[PDB]
């Protein structure tokens, strides 16, 4: 299926003394592969997946230099934005950045993205065509003009369509044993009685990868959303994911209800029933 490489960056200003806290993480699909934390001792980009350890010293030196350059841009940004928004030096503020590329089943470029937020709000984002910018307010508009004059979008477009795609392809091959493997959900159902007349059925999906999944209930073969609760998909902590969906039913009628599971690791969707 499709694949992605995405980088996430957060800087949080520290008004009283010193530079912002800066944290960078890189992912291929739902797998973290590198990190940098300004509070950590190494001051280096660090591996977080065994397949990236294949890369040599030049890689790690080059990624470290770039990630530090990213951190300094964020530091300057935090000051500029405090200026744009007429804010004091007293409060803590945040910038967040995400960028990366998607490829389809044929591993060719599909989509690129680059977006930026200040204090959790949209600030500026590259449009889908990778040629222009969406600026949310007049501050972002001043940035847009600055980036247009300096042809920032052209530089980014080249990276997103070229380097990003090339290196995603490289990682996919080097990490093939895990990155190109699907882990189908391990499913089961649990039962609880709330009272003499009400029951809860909970449909579980565990140990799956990638994170994308659909769990739904049917009653007598028709979709049931009322009286259901669906939790957010959550990391197990070993690289796989978990999710459940529950339905409340009259006691004795459990057999009308079926759980349906869709996942790329399942060639056809699965059905579960109580008992």
């Amino acid at each position: 299926g499709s694949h992605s490489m995405r980088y996430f960056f957060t800087s949080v200003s520290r008004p009283g003394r010193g530079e912002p806290r800066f944290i960078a993480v890189g992912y291929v699909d739902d797998t973290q592969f590198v990190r940098f934390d300004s509070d950590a001792a190494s001051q280096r980009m660090e591996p977080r997946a065994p397949w990236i350890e294949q890369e040599g010293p030049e890689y790690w030196d080059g990624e470290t230099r770039k990630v530090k350059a990213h951190s300094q841009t964020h530091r300057v940004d935090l000051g500029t934005l405090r200026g744009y928004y007429n804010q004091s030096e007293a409060g803590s503020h945040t910038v967040q950045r995400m960028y990366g590329c998607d490829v389809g089943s044929d591993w060719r470029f599909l989509r690129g993205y680059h977006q930026y937020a200040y204090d959790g709000k949209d600030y500026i984002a590259l449009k889908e065509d990778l040629r222009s910018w969406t600026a949310a307010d007049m501050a972002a508009q001043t940035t847009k003009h600055k980036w247009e004059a300096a042809h920032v979008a052209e530089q980014l477009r080249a990276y997103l369509e070229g380097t990003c795609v090339e290196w995603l392809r490289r990682y996919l091959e080097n990490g093939k044993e895990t990155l190109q493997r699907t882990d189908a959900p391990k499913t089961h159902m649990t039962h609880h009685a709330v009272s003499d007349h009400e029951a809860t059925l909970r449909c579980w999906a565990l140990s799956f990868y990638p994170a994308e999944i659909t769990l739904t209930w049917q009653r007598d073969g028709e979709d049931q959303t009322q009286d259901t609760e669906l939790v957010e998909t959550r990391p197990a902590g070993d690289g796989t994911f978990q999710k459940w969906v529950a339905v409340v039913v009259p006691s004795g009628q459990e057999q009308r209800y079926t759980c349906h599971v869709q996942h790329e690791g399942l060639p056809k969707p699965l059905t579960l029933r109580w008992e």
Binding site: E63, K66, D77, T80, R97, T143, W147, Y159, E166
Partner: peptide
Amino acid sequence: NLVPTVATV
């Protein structure tokens, strides 16, 4: 592989 340069706002 990170983008080579990042423009300031």
